[PDB]
Amino acid sequence: QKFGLSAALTTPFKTDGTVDIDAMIAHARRCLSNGCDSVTLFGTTGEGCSVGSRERQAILSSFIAAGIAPSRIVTGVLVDSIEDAADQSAEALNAGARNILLAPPSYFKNVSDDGLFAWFSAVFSKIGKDARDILVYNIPSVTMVTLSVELVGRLKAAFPGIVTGVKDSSGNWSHTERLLKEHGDLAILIGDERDLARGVRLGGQGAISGVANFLTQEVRAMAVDGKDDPRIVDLVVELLKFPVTPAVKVLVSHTTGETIWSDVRAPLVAISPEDRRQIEGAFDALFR
Amino acid sequence: KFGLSAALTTPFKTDGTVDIDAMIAHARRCLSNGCDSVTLFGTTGEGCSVGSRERQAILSSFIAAGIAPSRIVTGVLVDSIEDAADQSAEALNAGARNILLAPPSYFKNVSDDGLFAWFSAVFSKIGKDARDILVYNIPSVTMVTLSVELVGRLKAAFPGIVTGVKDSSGNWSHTERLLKEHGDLAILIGDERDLARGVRLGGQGAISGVANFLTQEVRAMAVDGKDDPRIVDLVVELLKFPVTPAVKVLVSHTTGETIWSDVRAPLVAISPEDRRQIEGAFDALFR
Numbered sequence: 001q002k003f004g005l006s007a008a009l010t011t012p013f014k015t016d017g018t019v020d021i022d023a024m025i026a027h028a029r030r031c032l033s034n035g036c037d038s039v040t041l042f043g044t045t046g047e048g049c050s051v052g053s054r055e056r057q058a059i060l061s062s063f064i065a066a067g068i069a070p071s072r073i074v075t076g077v078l079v080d081s082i083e084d085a086a087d088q089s090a091e092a093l094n095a096g097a098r099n100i101l102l103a104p105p106s107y108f109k110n111v112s113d114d115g116l117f118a119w120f121s122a123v124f125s126k127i128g129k130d131a132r133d134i135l136v137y138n139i140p141s142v143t144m145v146t147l148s149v150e151l152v153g154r155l156k157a158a159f160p161g162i163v164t165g166v167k168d169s170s171g172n173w174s175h176t177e178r179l180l181k182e183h184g185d186l187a188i189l190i191g192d193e194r195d196l197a198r199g200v201r202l203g204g205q206g207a208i209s210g211v212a213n214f215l216t217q218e219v220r221a222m223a224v225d226g227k228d229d230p231r232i233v234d235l236v237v238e239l240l241k242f243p244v245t246p247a248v249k250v251l252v253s254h255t256t257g258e259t260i261w262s263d264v265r266a267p268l269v270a271i272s273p274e275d276r277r278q279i280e281g282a283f284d285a286l287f288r
Numbered sequence: 289k290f291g292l293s294a295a296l297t298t299p300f301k302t303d304g305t306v307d308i309d310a311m312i313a314h315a316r317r318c319l320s321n322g323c324d325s326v327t328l329f330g331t332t333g334e335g336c337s338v339g340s341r342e343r344q345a346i347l348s349s350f351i352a353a354g355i356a357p358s359r360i361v362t363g364v365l366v367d368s369i370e371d372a373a374d375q376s377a378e379a380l381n382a383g384a385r386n387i388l389l390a391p392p393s394y395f396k397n398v399s400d401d402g403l404f405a406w407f408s409a410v411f412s413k414i415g416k417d418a419r420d421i422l423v424y425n426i427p428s429v430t431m432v433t434l435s436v437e438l439v440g441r442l443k444a445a446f447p448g449i450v451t452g453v454k455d456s457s458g459n460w461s462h463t464e465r466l467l468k469e470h471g472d473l474a475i476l477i478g479d480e481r482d483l484a485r486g487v488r489l490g491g492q493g494a495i496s497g498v499a500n501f502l503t504q505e506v507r508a509m510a511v512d513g514k515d516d517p518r519i520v521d522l523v524v525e526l527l528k529f530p531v532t533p534a535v536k537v538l539v540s541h542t543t544g545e546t547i548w549s550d551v552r553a554p555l556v557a558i559s560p561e562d563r564r565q566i567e568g569a570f571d572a573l574f575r
């Protein structure tokens with residue numbers, strides 16, 4: 001019944017910049033076959049911020065027509081208005097998505113817990129009676145919006161069955177450990193690989209993982225089975241030298257032989273040939 | 289020249305919906321009191337908090353009420369090429385004077401090359417209709433600085449498409465370089481300390497939050513290039529609080545319209561004590 005392992009699925013682009021939907025679906029099927037319980041579309045690693053509001057509708061519809069069960073799909077929602085967050089969430093939930101991965105709004109800076117509580121509440125009200133299965137996304141290194149333990153408690157208390165978990169990508173164990181003690185009744189999912197297995201052993205329900213795009217079984221052992229893997233921790237450090245999402249895509253290409261993954265959407269830029277060789281070398285030293 | 293545009297505040301009802309009547313009346317007041325245009329859905333307008341459907345209804349309502357499209361600028365503050373192009377094309381097709389286009393603001397620490405590619409892709413997607421884009425440099429909010437070099441690249445590649453820059457950095461050495469290197473474009477200045485000086489150096493005006501409640505005073509800076517230390521001193525005061533909620537406090541104070549108090553989450557309304565402080569600071573300078 002736990003959340004388990006979800007791939008933070010990468011989004012492949014053709015040379016003309018459009019989404020390669022067949023390649024995307026095939027990659028999802030591979031990740032599911034290799035140990036993911038679900039795939040998360042349009043998250044950070046998916047460049048979801050860069051995927052249009054019409055594109056995401058086309059992609060979700062195509063995934064469902066291709067026969068991937070909606071209950072094996074999580075959709076990231078990374079927008080700044082109540083209306084758009086509710087609309088995107090409602091559409092995915094109506095389609096049968098397992099969960100929404102909902103970021104707080106990320107335009108205004110230095111926002112208060114009270115402001116955030118009110119925003120989430122307004123989104124949930126706007127979704128309406130069908131609201132369910134929202135995982136709130138704590139990724140302050142990207143959004144510059146922390147979801148405090150206290151805020152998570154306020155949300156859980158007010159919205160039982162609606163706020164069902166937290167994706168904690170803070171890399172702040174002092175925070176994560178409190179999420180587990182106070183809110184481990186929810187699905188507490190852990191972004192920082194060094195504390196993933198540790199957190200699973202303390203009741204964490206898994207991960208929405210970028211590395212799981214190319215080391216699925218290895219991440220599953222951590223996220224589901226609660227087993228450490230120092231090689232994964234080391235890989236993530238070795239890759240700090242490079243933009244995270246473009247480097248993950250380089251390793252999808254390296255492990256699969258699929259050249260499509262090279263390409264990223266602006267405002268990201270391609271990893272250079274020399275830097276790709278460094279990334280592949282770091283991977284090979286650990287896993288090949 | 290561009291002149292003075294109000295960075296128009298967006299009024300909300302107690303139930304949270306947009307008070308479109310109050311918004312249009314406020315725009316007419318700002319226009320009548322010295323704005324050449326009004327900018328909808330910018331930072332001061334809480335544009336990030338205005339939904340993709342709401343903005344369409346608001347823009348249609350403005351135009352149906354008889355506000356000239358050539359006196360409307362629309363902020364576009366999204367992170368995807370498709371949505372930036374869709375929103376921009378819609379406003380341009382409706383006859384908006386300009387788009388105020390922010391760079392995407394989810395990913396952090398992005399490169400000039402990535403930004404050039406993003407803007408280029410937006411403009412290609414809009415197509416031949418693309419015109420009158422003001423690129424928005426507000427790094428204190430977006431965490432994305434538009435460098436002088438990037439502005440040059442955009443101007444060179446997209447003449448008539450990239451027609452200006454709204455520089456809200458408050459970084460004079462930056463602004464001064466924009467003016468000196470790219471003053472052939474409409475360089476508009478957000479920092480009040482810098483507005484009149486920049487206008488004297490060839491700046492074309494401002495999209496101004498303070499112009500919601502001190503329109504004539506900002507016009508003398510933005511159009512006539514005259515320093516006003518009172519405005520600078522007031523901005524020092526407004527920067528002690530979340531800026532947009534504090535601006536709204538002063539729209540309420542100067543107009544007697546209570547509606548402006550309310551802000552949309554994730555903002556929170558200014559407290560009664562802080563409101564009296566802001567009003568007192570204003571009164572000490574302007575009343």
Ligand SMILES: [Mg+2]
Pocket residue numbers: 078079080106107365366367393394
């Ligand atoms: Mg955004």
